[PDB]
Design a protein around this ligand. Structure first.
Ligand code: HEM
Length: 151
C-alpha cells in the first residue's frame, strides 16, 4: 500500500510523462522490444520492427505509446483504488493478448529506465521507489485477476 505522499511522487512524475506521452511511450516500447525480443512476437501489428532504428522511425510505436501510457496513467491516477480501471485490461491481456506476468515485469523495468533517461535530474531515489511500488501494485493486482480468470 502506498502512502498519499508516495502517490504524489508518482503523479508528479506522471505529469512529466504527459508532456511528451508519445515519445515516452515509444521509448518504453523500444526498450521492451530491444531488451526482451520475445515480447515483440506478441504484437502481430508491430513485429516487422526488429531493429531499434526501425522501431524509432515507426509512426506505429509513437501512436501505440499513447495507447499504453494513457491507460497506465488512468490506473495510476486511481491510486490503487483501481480495480474497475484495471479489470478490463487484465481480461484483455490474459485472454486475447496472452501476456504473462513476467512480461509486465519487463515493461515495468522499461518504464523506470525511460523515466530515468528522460528526467535525469528530476527522477530521484524517492520518486523511483514510489514508482516501483505503484508498478508492483499494478502487477500484483493484474496477477490476482489472472488467477481469478484461470490464466
Ligand atoms: C503497463 C502495462 C500495459 C498497459 C497499461 C497496457 C495497455 C494496453 C491497452 C490500453 C491496449 C489496447 C486495448 C486492448 O487491446 O486491451 C493494449 C493492447 C495490447 N497489449 Fe498491452 N498493456 C500493457 C502491457 C503489455 C505488455 C507487456 C504486452 C506484451 C509484451 C502487451 C501486449 C498487448 C498487445 C499484443 C495488445 C494488442 C495491440 C494491438 O494489436 O493493437 N501489453 N495494451
Amino acid at each position: 500500500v502506498l502512502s498519499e505522499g508516495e502517490w504524489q511522487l508518482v503523479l508528479h512524475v506522471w505529469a512529466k510523462v504527459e508532456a511528451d506521452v508519445a515519445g515516452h511511450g515509444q521509448d518504453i516500447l523500444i526498450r521492451l522490444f530491444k531488451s526482451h525480443p520475445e515480447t515483440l512476437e506478441k504484437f502481430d501489428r508491430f513485429k516487422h520492427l526488429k531493429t531499434e532504428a526501425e522501431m524509432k522511425a515507426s509512426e506505429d510505436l509513437k501512436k501505440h505509446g499513447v495507447t499504453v501510457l494513457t491507460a497506465l496513467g488512468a490506473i495510476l491516477k486511481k491510486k490503487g483504488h483501481h480495480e474497475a480501471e484495471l479489470k478490463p485490461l487484465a481480461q484483455s491481456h490474459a485472454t486475447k493478448h496472452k501476456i504473462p506476468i513476467k512480461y509486465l515485469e519487463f515493461i515495468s523495468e522499461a518504464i523506470i529506465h525511460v523515466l530515468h533517461s528522460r528526467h535525469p535530474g528530476d527522477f530521484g531515489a524517492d520518486a523511483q521507489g514510489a514508482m516501483n511500488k505503484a508498478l508492483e501494485l499494478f502487477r500484483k493486482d493484474i496477477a490476482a485477476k489472472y488467477k481469478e480468470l484461470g490464466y
